[PDB]
Amino acid sequence: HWGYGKHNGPEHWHKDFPIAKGERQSPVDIDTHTAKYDPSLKPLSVSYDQATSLRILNNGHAFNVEFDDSQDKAVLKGGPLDGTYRLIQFHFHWGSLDGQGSEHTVDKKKYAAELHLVHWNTKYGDFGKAVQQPDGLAVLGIFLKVGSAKPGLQKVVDVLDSIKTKGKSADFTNFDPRGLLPESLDYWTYPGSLTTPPLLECVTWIVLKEPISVSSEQVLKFRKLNFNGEGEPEELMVDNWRPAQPLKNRQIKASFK
């Protein structure tokens, strides 16, 4: 089955998911000189005051912090979006070293990791219907660099030992995702896809310009996770990122600048 290796990693995905070679795949390199400042773009509105985190889960590709998305609670709007998009989960992608790990790149720079806050368009009623639509999802992407710790990250890191292996889940209530955001909401945006199989071309990407800083110790705990399940040989969960894909006929827009 797909994963991040030589025999089942990103260069193999297209055999099961031919959409991998499509016209609006993610991630991309954000060439900052070529991105268009669009004065028509709005501030992004991130309303996470009532977010209800529920569970943290090791799905075997990354970990997901899940939210109760059955009410209008944690929503993304504005920016390039029409409508309202409700938060369902976040997860990260990260490297084996600090010099790699992000999916998007900025003038070919790789960050140590990238946070994805996944939201679905309420006009489609649920996530599963949204992913079948070209405007179904909005992903807020945030780069991580290694430096000073991110205090609002520590609750996530400290639960990771309880979800080491694939399949594990732990109650994870009262986690506030506002503690993962940078100061600025300046962003780039473009139409793209999920970066994991099934690679559906349903995402408006919103990538923040300002990274957050996390400590070496915090990203070292992400790298202790395992891609395998309990009782199977250890394969550390590192380098769970898909490389930049061809931009093809797309324009990246800047909200700033």
Ligand X SMILES: CCCCNC(=O)c1cc(S(N)(=O)=O)c(Cl)cc1Cl
Annotated binding site for substrate: 195-196
Q: Does 130 bind ligand X (CB under 6 A)?
A: no
Q: Does 113 bind ligand X (CB under 6 A)?
A: no
Q: Does 116 bind ligand X (CB under 6 A)?
A: yes
Q: Does 116 bind Zn ion (CB under 5 A)?
A: yes
Strand duo 63-67 + 84-94: pairing: antiparallel
Shortest Å, Cβ 129 to ligand X: 14
Q: What is the CA radius of gyration of the chain?
A: 17
Strand duo 53-58 + 36-37: pairing: unpaired
- Residue 139 touches which of Zn ion, ligand X, none (CB < 5 to 8 A by kind)? ligand X
Q: How many residues bind ligand X (CB under 6 A)?
A: 12
DSSP string, 32-59: TTTSEE-TTPPPEEEE-TT--EEEEEE-
Which of 80, 95, 4 has the alpha carbon at shortest distance from 44? 80
What's 156's DSSP letter?
H
Distance set, CA 130 to CA 81, 220, 253, 255 (Å): 14, 35, 23, 25
Which lies closer to Zn ion via its Cβ, residue 38 or residue 55? 55
Per CB under 6 A, the segment of 42-50, 58-66, 179-187, 221-229 that binds ligand X is 58-66
Q: Does 242 bind Zn ion (CB under 5 A)?
A: no
**Active-site position among 12, 61, 104, 119:** 61
Q: Is 119 helix (H, G, I), strand (E, B) or coil?
A: strand
Tokens 């945030």 belong to 142
The contact pattern for ligand X, residues 167-196, with x = CB under 6 A and - = no contact, is ---------------------------xxx
Residues for the chain: how many in total?
A: 257
Of residues 199 through 218, those in contact with ligand X by CB under 6 A are: 203
Which lies closer to ligand X via its Cβ, residue 61 or residue 253? 61
Q: Is 33 a catalytic residue?
A: no
Q: Does 137 bind ligand X (CB under 6 A)?
A: yes
Positions annotated as catalytic residues are 61
Interface positions with Zn ion (CB under 5 A):
116
